[PDB]
Amino acid sequence: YFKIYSKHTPINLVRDLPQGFSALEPLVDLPIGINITRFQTLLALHRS
Amino acid sequence: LTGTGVLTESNKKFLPFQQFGRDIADTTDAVRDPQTLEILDITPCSFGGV
Ligand SMILES: *[C@@H]1O[C@H](CO)[C@@H](O)[C@H](O)[C@H]1NC(C)=O
């Protein structure tokens, strides 16, 4: 069972993580039933 | 989820994921109706010593 919990916070700090408390609401309960041992995030390029 | 209790309109503001609610003692004191999404308190039926 792949559980996605999510939270969006309006912040204004420049560099590091803000210091505070924010609980993550459950977003998606996903029925995959597969083995996961490694992950990789996806970025977006800018072309000019 | 079966039970017996007085259903009253609730002042609790359930979040969208949250379906049923637990009290101080972790008993189901509030429930969300599956047809009309409203919150109802479940006070137990009056108990007395005769
Ligand atoms: C059917 O149930 C959904 C939620 O489960 C609700 O939004 C909708 O109003 C209901 N429709 C009727 C006709 O009761």
How was this structure determined? It was done by: cryo-EM
| Resolution value, angstrom units | 3.0
Question: Which has the closest alpha carbon to A29: A7, A3, A9?
Answer: A3
Q: Which amino acid is at A19?
A: Q
Give the strand order in the sheet containing B28-32.
Answer: B6-9, B39-43, B28-32, B20-22
Ligand 1, atom 14: closest residue by C-alpha: B35
Is the CB of residue B2 below 6 angstroms from any atom belonging to ligand 1?
A: no
CA distances from A1 to A4, A20, A29, A32 (A): 10, 29, 7, 6
Contacts of A26 in chain B (CB under 8 A): 17
